[PDB]
Amino acid sequence: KEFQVLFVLTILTLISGTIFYSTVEGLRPIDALYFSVVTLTTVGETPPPQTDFGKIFTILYIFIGIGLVFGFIHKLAVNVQLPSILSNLVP
Amino acid sequence: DKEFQVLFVLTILTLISGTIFYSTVEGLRPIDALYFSVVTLTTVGETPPPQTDFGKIFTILYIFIGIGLVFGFIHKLAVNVQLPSILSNLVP
Amino acid sequence: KEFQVLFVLTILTLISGTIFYSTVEGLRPIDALYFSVVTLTTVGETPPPQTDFGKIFTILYIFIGIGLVFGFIHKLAVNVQLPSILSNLVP
Amino acid sequence: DKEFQVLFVLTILTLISGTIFYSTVEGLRPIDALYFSVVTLTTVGETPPPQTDFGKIFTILYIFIGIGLVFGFIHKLAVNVQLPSILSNLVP
C-alpha cells in the first residue's frame, strides 16, 4: 500500500483539476471537481471545455491523469474491495 | 462459477442502488435512472450530467466504487461465460 | 486467429445494433451503425436513445457487447497492429 | 525505452491525422479538431458527434485503429515513465 500513495496521487490530480476548471472555466468547485472525475475516468458526460486554454490543459490532463486514476481504481478493486467482499461472505 | 454469480449479484445490487438514488433524487423515471447508472459505470456515459449537487457528489463516489465491479463482471462474463459459449458454437 | 472469429463476432454485433437502432430509434443506418460503435467502445458522444425499448436494449447491448469489442480491439492491436508496426521498422 | 518513444510518435501521428481530418472535413478549428481526436480515442469522448457522413465513417475506423495505440501509450507512459518518476519522489 501503494494504495494510499495511489489514493493521494489521485486526490492531488483531482484537486489540481478542481482548481484549474474552477478558475479558468469559471466553474463552481463542485462542477469543476465533477468534470475532472468524469473526464479522467472517461465517463465524460458533460459539455466540453469552452476555453482554448481549457481544451489544451484538458488534453494534457487526460494523458497524464487517466493512467493514475485507473491504477487507483484497479488497486482499490483488487486490494480493497475484493478482501472486503470476500470477508463479508465468510459464514 | 460462484465468482460469476457473486459478481452478477454485486452488479445488480449496485445498479439497483443507482436506480433508486437517481430515480428519487434526480426525479428520473426508474428506466432512465437505471440507464444513467449503466452508461455511467461502464463509462459510455452519453447523457447530460446530474442536475443536483447531491447527485454530483454521489455520482462521483458511485463511479469510483462501481466501475471496478462492473468491469470485473464484464470481464468474468466474457472470459468464463461468453468465451466457452461462444467457443463451442464452433465445435463441428 | 481467433482474430477472424473476433472480427466476425464484432461485425455481427454491430450489424444487429445497426438493424435495431435503425428500425426502433428511426435512425439512418449510418447513424445507427455509429451509435452502436461509439456506445460499445464507450466513446459514447451521442444523445441517448429516445425509446424505452431502445434504453432497455442498449443496456443489454452494452453488457453483452463491450467485452467482445474490446477483446477484438485487444487482439487487433496485439496480433495485427504490433507485427505490422514492427515489420515497418525493420531496416 | 525506444518502445515508449515509438509509442509516443505513433500517437502523435494518429492525433495529427485526426486533427488534419476533422479540421478539413468537419470544418473544425485545429484546436477543436485535435481535442475531438483526443477525447474520442481515449473514449472520454464528451462532445457532440461528427456532422458529416464521411466524418462518421472515418471516426468509426479511427476509433478501432486508434484506441489500442492510445491506450498502449497511456499504459507504457504510466508503467515505464510515471511509475519510476513517481517512485523516487519517495526515495528519502
DSSP string, C49-78: PSSHHHHHHHHHHHHHHHHHHHHHHHHIII
Crossing angle for the helix pair A52-75 and D53-76, nearest 10 degrees?
50
Q: Are C45 and B46 in contact (CB under 8 A)?
A: yes
How many CB pairs lie under 8 A apart between chains A and B?
48
Out of D53, D60, D68, name the one closest to residue C37 (CB). Answer: D60
Residue A91's CB is within 10 A of a number of other CB atoms, namely 2
Experimental method: X-ray
Contact residues on chain C for D10, CB-CB shorter than 8 A: 85
Domain C1-91 has CATH 1.10.3720.10: no
Q: Which cell goes with C68?
A: 467482445
Tell me how far CA of residue A37 lies from CA of A19, A29, B7, C29, in angstroms. Answer: 13, 12, 25, 34
Closest residue, chain C, to D37 (C-alpha): C43
| DSSP state at residue C88 | T
Asked whether the beta carbons of A45 and D46 are under 8 A apart, the reply is yes
Peptide linkage before C45 cis (omega within 30 of 0)? no
What region does D13 belong to: left with phi over 0, alpha with psi -120 to 50, or beta?
Answer: alpha
Query: C78 is written with which cell numbers?
Result: 496485439
**Residue reference for cell 495511489:** A6
A41/B46 Cβ within 8 A: no
Among A65, A31, A28, residue whose Cα is nearest residue A45: A31
- Grid cell for residue D86: 513517481
Residue B20 to residue B25: CA distance in whole angstroms: 8
Q: How far apart are CA A43 and CA B5, in angstroms?
A: 26
Contact A62, D38 (CB under 8 A): yes
Whether the CB-CB separation of C58 and C26 falls below 8 Å is answered with no
Q: Contacts of residue A42 in chain D, CB cutoff 8 Å? A: 42-44
- What is the C-alpha separation between D77 and B84, in angstroms, rounded? 34
Cα distances (angstroms) measured from residue A21 to each of A34, B46, C44, D38, D43: 10, 21, 23, 18, 20
d(C-alpha D74, C-alpha D1), whole Å: 14
CB pairs under 8 A between B and C: 50
Cross-chain Cβ contact A5/D74 below 8 Å: no
Of B47, B56, B72, the CB nearest to A34: B56
Exposure of C79 by Cβ count < 10 A (0-12 exposed, 13-18 middle, 19+ buried)?
A: middle
Which class is domain D1-92?
A: mainly alpha
Give me the resolution in angstroms, 1 decimal.
2.7
CA distance D4 to D9: 9
Please list every residue in chain D whose beta carbon sits closer than 8 Å to the beta carbon of residue C89.
6
Residue in the structure block whose three cell numbers are 466513446: C43
Q: Is C45 in contact with D49 (CB distance < 8 Å)?
A: yes
Q: Decide: B79 and B10 in contact? Cβ < 8 Å.
A: no
Of C38, C77, C89, the CB nearest to D72: C77
- Residue D54 identity (one-letter amino acid): F
Asked if B80 has any chain C CB less than 8 Å from its own CB, the reply is: no
Is C62 in contact with B38 (CB distance < 8 Å)?
yes
Inter-residue long-range contacts of A46-53, CB under 8 Å, 24+ positions, other chains counted: A46/B49, A46/D46, A47/D46, A47/D47, A48/D35, A48/D39, A48/D46, A48/D47, A49/A21, A49/A25, A50/A25, A51/A24, A51/A25, A52/D31, A53/A24
Torsion of CA A16, A18, A24, A28, to 10 degrees: -160
Question: What is the domain partition of chain A in residue ranges?
Answer: 1-91
The DSSP secondary-structure symbol of B83 reads: T
A61's CB contacts (< 8 A; 6+ apart) are A17, A20, A36, A39, A40
Rg of chain B taking only CA atoms, in angstroms: 16
CA atoms within 13 A on the CB side of A3: 10
What is residue D26's three-state secondary structure? coil
Sign of CA dihedral A8, A10, A16, A18: negative
Is the CB of A45 inside 8 Å of chain B's CB atoms? yes
Residue corresponding to grid cell 489514493? A7
Residue B36 burial class via C-beta count within 10 angstroms: exposed 0-12, middle 13-18, buried 19 and up: buried
Q: Which DSSP letter does residue D83 get?
A: T
* Cα nearest neighbour of A31 on chain B: B56
CB < 8 Å to C7, chain D? none
Q: Does C15 touch chain D (CB under 8 A)?
A: no
Residue contact B72–A77, C-beta within 8 A:
yes
